[PDB]
Design a protein around this ligand. Structure first.
Ligand SMILES: C[C@@H]1C[C@H]1COC(C)(C)[C@@H]1C[C@H]1[C@]12CN(c3ncccn3)C[C@H]1CSC(N)=N2
Length: 391
């Protein structure tokens, strides 16, 4: 396996709790900013005014290439909001393709619970499709602009690398957090085969889950439940989020598999950390989780399997200790399944926009132990998979 995109390998930093980001520049002369990679939204937006959590921001008045679109944008969401002013400017990715494009930029002027203290990022790169752009689908997303204006192939791929232990801001700054390969697939970043699932519709990166197992035991729900009301791949969500009824069934099964140790309700609610003496985390008592995804071939599926090393998120102790501590990074959703950062950390994920498909392979940087690894395996004969999609 040769790695043919050396310029872009190791261009991400960050972690599942706070986001993975890439360096970008905006304006003339170039203003450098760290930008959250978000496959669950479709706007390119940057801090453009002082904020307690920003150490830098886009200064439109210092860019000779700034263009004012004379239009506001307001982006409320469940846990927060940002608002700002639309414009365009020249944009580059230093550890990216050697191209500069003119792109839409939302200059964030006000926000609430959007920016994250100590995360090191100052803006967001929404990589999903125009349908979910704000204020509407007429605001061309960045990746669309990049493809239209250059010879960059209509594809990107993400290797998000969890450390398997906590990092402070200093360690995050000094550590490689993964790769975003723009326009290609780098063979050094994965092992085994890539398996592809269709993009069901181009809005979010929507997929269809057809079967769920906990340690090989079928959760045995009608597969529509797994995709109620959608299933998406979202680097801008920390957890694996599951629809309420699926969450309840999965947690029951994970508790049963791990029953040799009792954990408090607050742990299963994703609120409370649990800790073990250094090196003694009992990985083996926790089950693997397999999600079967619709394949590209009629009546064929494949599965991705994650370990507790993926779904238990490393956190620092509430106290001063050498304990190894974690939070449970599976949580309930009322807006469908979200395959967030903790599940993406297991896999190299290929967003093949050109062929309307998402590829998964075992990540070369997934955390595991001597006894088990993450897996991507197939094929399986699976019938009536279209019926698993919610309408
Ligand atoms: C792993 C990393 C810590 C995670 C980042 O957390 C925040 C900052 C809350 C993510 C980046 C925020 C959003 C942006 N957004 C949105 N909705 C509609 C239109 C435009 N944008 C919803 C919102 C939550 S979900 C998501 N994918 N993106």
């Amino acid at each position: 396996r040769r790695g043919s995109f050396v310029e872009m390998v190791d261009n991400l930093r960050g972690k599942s709790g706070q986001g993975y980001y890439v360096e970008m520049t905006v304006g003339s002369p170039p203003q450098t900013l760290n930008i959250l990679v978000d496959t669950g939204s479709s706007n390119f937006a940057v801090g453009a005014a002082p904020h307690p959590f920003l150490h830098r921001y886009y200064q439109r008045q210092l860019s000779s290439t700034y263009r004012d679109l004379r239009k506001g944008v307001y982006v409320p969401y469940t846990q927060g909001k940002w608002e700002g002013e639309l414009g365009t400017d020249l944009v580059s990715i230093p550890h990216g393709p050697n191209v500069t494009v003119r792109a839409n930029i939302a200059a964030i002027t006000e926000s609430d619970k959007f920016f994250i203290n100590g995360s090191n990022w100052e803006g967001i790169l929404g990589l999903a499709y125009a349908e979910i752009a704000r204020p509407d689908d007429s605001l061309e997303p960045f990746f669309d602009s990049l493809v239209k204006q250059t010879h960059v192939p209509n594809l990107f791929s993400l290797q998000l690398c969890g450390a398997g232990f906590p990092l402070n801001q200093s360690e995050v700054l000094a550590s490689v957090g993964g790769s975003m390969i723009i326009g290609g697939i780098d063979h050094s970043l994965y092992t085994g085969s890539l398996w592809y699932t269709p993009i069901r519709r181009e809005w979010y990166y929507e997929v269809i889950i057809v079967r769920v197992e906990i340690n090989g035991q079928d959760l045995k729900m009608d597969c529509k439940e797994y995709n109620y009301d959608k299933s998406i791949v979202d680097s801008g969500t920390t957890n694996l989020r599951l629809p309420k009824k699926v969450f309840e069934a999965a947690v029951k099964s994970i508790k049963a598999a791990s029953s040799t140790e009792k954990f408090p309700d607050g742990f299963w609610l994703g609120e409370q950390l649990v800790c073990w003496q250094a090196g003694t985390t009992p990985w083996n008592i926790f089950p693997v989780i397999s999600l079967y995804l619709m394949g590209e071939v009629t009546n064929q599926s494949f599965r991705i399997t994650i370990l507790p090393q993926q779904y238990l998120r490393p956190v620092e102790d509430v106290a001063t200790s050498q304990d190894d501590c974690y939070k449970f990074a599976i949580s309930q959703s009322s807006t469908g399944t979200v395959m967030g950062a903790v599940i993406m950390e297991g896999f190299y994920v290929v967003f093949d926009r050109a062929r309307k498909r998402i590829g998964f392979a075992v990540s070369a940087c997934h955390v595991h132990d001597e006894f088990r690894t993450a897996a991507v395996e197939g094929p399986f004969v699976t019938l009536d998979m279209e019926d698993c999609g919610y309408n």
